[PDB]
Design a binder for these strands. Structure first.
Lengths: 98, 113, 297, 119
RNA sequence: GGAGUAUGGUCGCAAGGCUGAAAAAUUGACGGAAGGGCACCACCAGGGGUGGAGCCUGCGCGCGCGCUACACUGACAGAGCCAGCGAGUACUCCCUUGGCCGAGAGGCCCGGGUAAACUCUGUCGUGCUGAGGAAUCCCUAGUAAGCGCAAGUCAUCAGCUUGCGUUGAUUACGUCCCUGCCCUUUGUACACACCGCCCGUCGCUACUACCGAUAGAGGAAGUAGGUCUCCGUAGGUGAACCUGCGGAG
RNA sequence: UUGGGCUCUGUGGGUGCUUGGCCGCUGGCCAGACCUACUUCAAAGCCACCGGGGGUACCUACCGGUUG
């Protein structure tokens, strides 16, 4: 039996494939290859609550929408969906007789 | 396992011993495993109601491979024989020996011919 | 394969006898550690035991984790507990009747990842070898007298126990008409054990408890509307299985749905189903003198 | 042993060594550092060489027959053959030892139990 | 005498009736619509019980679970041919007329009450000599039914139960449309890829203001950029040398 | 086919792609032969495999000292 499965990270860079590669004079890759940066657009930026601006909030679609422009209807609906996410996770005689 | 979820889909089973060889059908539907259960197991998976099927062997399994024309599947068994089976009619279209046809030996440290 | 199961069987027995000897020794070992902890004097023999001191300094800490409850003791069971959703099959004796096959159906529906098989004219050691060939985790033979159930055999593979137990006071589903009863609610229920206090008691508790899918450990109390209840008085394991609805936090409304068993267990053979070379771990001992009166469990 | 007893990584190394040796084939328990302390044995490694494990598993009679047999090569291990009589055999493999593709030792067995079928 | 380990005796506390049976909560409560998976407690195809007569255990005269009768699936006669469980000095169907030998308790003797199946060949030809409705319930590969032969496993089971061998099929083996059940709309690992903020009624928490009795608890509602070298200098620890300043290459 | 067989031993080849036997070799020899000269200058370090826990009276080594 091999080992205990240990948690382990490996920090990538943003370089190209042919930059990550080993030592050759000229890659097997052509010209359409040789430019992708090892990290997707999701990696280079994720729209999220912690990176949002002040007056606005982002959706699950990834759309920053303003609390100011938002009406009470979708306000309550958004709060309802987030709550559902959480859910799935001696005195006086005058005072007495009167 | 499933490449999008990454969590364990399923244990399959039906094997007297370890599964020595693995091959998939290029259509996307049929699996074959081959093992020292003396079994060749065709695994009917991606319909709803999964099943097995045995091809019983006179011998034990060392490797399996496919035809891209996915009706045909072949088995290498350690007695040497190779066998082509029709995959739907799970039946032997042919078999042949290979012992003398690969008998090249006298490795050092052996007192055999 | 059959080789490697059989070799693991005998290996497990060998480790058990070793555990007996080392447990008798460790009875003398455990006396040291707390005596070190409290500074109180000990018996001077156990003091002047040389190998005890050397082996002590090597092997305190497993006893520490035993005290902590950290570690998982050796048995048939505790290899893969909360990992494999334990597959359970059921099959009656050689030629079942109608009510019997319906009650086996129901008890397939009571244990929730249970598949049912029908047995036909099929041979008992080959059923055992075939279940072993599908890598199960249970098998349950349930016998009949005259359109009523008799005896459940909760056997647990790869080489654990067969609890053969007579049932008493059983009445089924399929008498109550389909309008009054409903189709069963198949969810991963909870499990509640009432009154087990002897080590044999908790042994039987273990072999019942691993017939159930591992409830997801996040909100075990709130979710789930299905519970199953084993409870014993006069050694008599009695089960009632209830779907509740919870009208308040001061009142919960039950619904009796699973059947009514009161099983008395008469053997735990530490050997699987057919294996008549059995290691009799316990039995209902009638026929002796005060074995009628006194209580196991 | 030198490590203090309350150390989590100490218990992890304990269970580590004992699990790897219990699946190796040297030891007998999985619980005692003492058993590691004066149970681990060059005779235990010797007892896990492939001659003596086919003796105990009752292939041959004693380790002469076993060792000569392996020299002229009659014992497959799962799929490979065997030339080199110190192939250590773990507890997992002590079941899948068996005889080779067709040898006269296999036919000694089968000629005796009268299942000799030349096919 | 020290240390434990018990066994029961002794004493203190627990052992003083504003009493008289029938919540928490920012997380909470219940739903609905879309999306998948599953199921002989679903569809589709089929089979087969029970339910008709009787026997009868069990459950409360009723009831099902078994067993048996019911005619072409015929009989009778011959011939031919194959199994698995199976071994404790151990297993018996009764109860009686006579007689024997027993001075008596008995024992004798005679009466009365290593399959099933299959296959083949001939002899006869339907004949009180009629295969179970509504209902329901079960079942998908050695699965259903039919057949026997054995064993009797402390518990239950001879009114049977359990094994094991034999002959071995149709019909599905798709589908979530019915009934459903489960679960997605949170969390749970990132790629090329796709999608694109379900909905409801309320509750609870913060705030706003109101109402009126006699500061007040309530009722109700709403918002959350000059280096190198040379020179001329001044000072420094002086030949030199260093520093600062000013000119040249 | 005017005798033949088993079995063992012995020899040579081949079981790998065909460029000499020897020597103090740009040369000589296989019958050989010649035999003891000549001389400017020791060295740069490092590495170096003993089964584990344990003791160190004496020896070895290292380090740090001490008289001469």
């Amino acid at each position: 039996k091999p080992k205990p499965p240990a948690p382990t990270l490996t920090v990538v860079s943003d370089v190209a494939t042919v930059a990550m590669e080993d030592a050759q004079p000229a890659t097997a890759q052509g010209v359409a290859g040789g430019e992708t940066s090892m990290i997707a657009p999701q990696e280079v930026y994720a729209p999220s609550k912690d990176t949002a601006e002040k007056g606005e909030v982002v959706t699950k679609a990834g759309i920053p929408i303003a609390k100011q422009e938002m009406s009470r209807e979708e306000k309550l609906r958004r709060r309802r969906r987030e709550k559902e996410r959480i859910r799935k996770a001696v005195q006086s005689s005058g005072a007495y007789k009167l | 396992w499933s490449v999008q979820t990454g969590q364990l889909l399923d244990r399959l089973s039906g094997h007297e011993g370890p599964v020595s060889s693995l091959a998939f059908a290029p259509d996307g539907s049929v699996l074959v495993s081959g093992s020292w259960d003396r079994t060749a197991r065709i695994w009917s998976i991606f319909s709803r109601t999964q099943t097995s099927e045995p091809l019983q062997l006179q011998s034990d399994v060392l490797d399996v491979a496919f035809r891209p024309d996915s009706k045909q599947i072949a088995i290498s068994t350690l007695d040497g024989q190779l066998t082509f089976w029709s995959v739907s009619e799970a039946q032997q279209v042919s078999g042949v020996d290979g012992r003398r046809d690969v008998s090249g030996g006298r490795r050092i440290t052996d007192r055999r011919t | 394969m059959l080789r490697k199961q059989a070799r693991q069987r005998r290996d497990y027995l060998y480790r058990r006898a070793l555990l007996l000897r080392d447990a008798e020794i460790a009875e003398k070992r455990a006396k040291l550690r707390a005596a070190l902890a409290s500074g109180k004097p000990l018996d001077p023999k156990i003091a002047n035991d040389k190998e005890l001191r050397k082996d002590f300094d090597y092997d305190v800490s497993r006893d520490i984790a035993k005290e902590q409850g950290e570690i998982d003791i050796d048995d048939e069971y505790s290899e893969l507990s909360g990992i494999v959703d334990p597959r359970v099959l059921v099959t009656t004796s050689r030629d079942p009747s109608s009510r019997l096959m319906a009650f086996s159906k129901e008890i397939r529906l009571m244990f929730p990842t249970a598949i049912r098989l029908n047995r036909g004219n099929l041979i008992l050691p080959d059923l055992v070898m075939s279940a072993q060939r599908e890598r199960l985790s249970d098998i349950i033979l349930l016998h009949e007298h005259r359109g009523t159930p008799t005896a459940i055999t909760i056997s647990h593979f790869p080489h654990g126990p067969t609890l053969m137990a007579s049932l008493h006071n059983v009445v089924l589903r399929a008498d109550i008409p389909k309008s009054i009863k409903g189709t069963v609610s198949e969810s991963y229920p909870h499990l509640i054990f009432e009154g087990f206090r002897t080590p044999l008691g908790q042994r039987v508790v273990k072999i019942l408890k691993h017939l159930f899918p591992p409830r997801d450990p996040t909100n075990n109390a709130k979710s789930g509307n299905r519970v199953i209840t084993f409870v014993n008085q006069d050694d008599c394991i009695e089960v009632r299985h209830h779907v509740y609805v919870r009208t308040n936090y001061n009142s919960v409304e039950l619904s009796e749905v699973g059947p009514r068993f009161t099983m008395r267990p008469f053997s735990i053979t530490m050997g699987t189903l057919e294996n008549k070379d059995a290691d009799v771990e316990w039995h209902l001992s009638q026929y002796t003198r005060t074995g009628r009166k006194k209580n196991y469990f | 042993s030198l490590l203090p007893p309350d150390n989590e990584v100490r218990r992890k190394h304990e269970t580590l060594l004992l699990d790897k040796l219990y699946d190796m084939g040297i030891l007998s328990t999985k619980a005692k550092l003492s058993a590691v302390e004066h149970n681990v044995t060059v005779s235990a490694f010797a007892r896990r060489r492939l001659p003596v494990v086919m003796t105990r598993l009752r292939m041959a009679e004693t380790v002469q027959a076993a060792t000569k047999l392996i020299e002229q090569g009659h014992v497959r291990v799962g799929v490979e053959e065997v030339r080199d009589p110190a192939f250590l055999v773990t507890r997992n493999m002590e079941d899948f030892v068996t005889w080779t593709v067709g040898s006269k030792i296999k036919q000694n067995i089968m000629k005796y139990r009268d299942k000799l079928d030349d096919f």
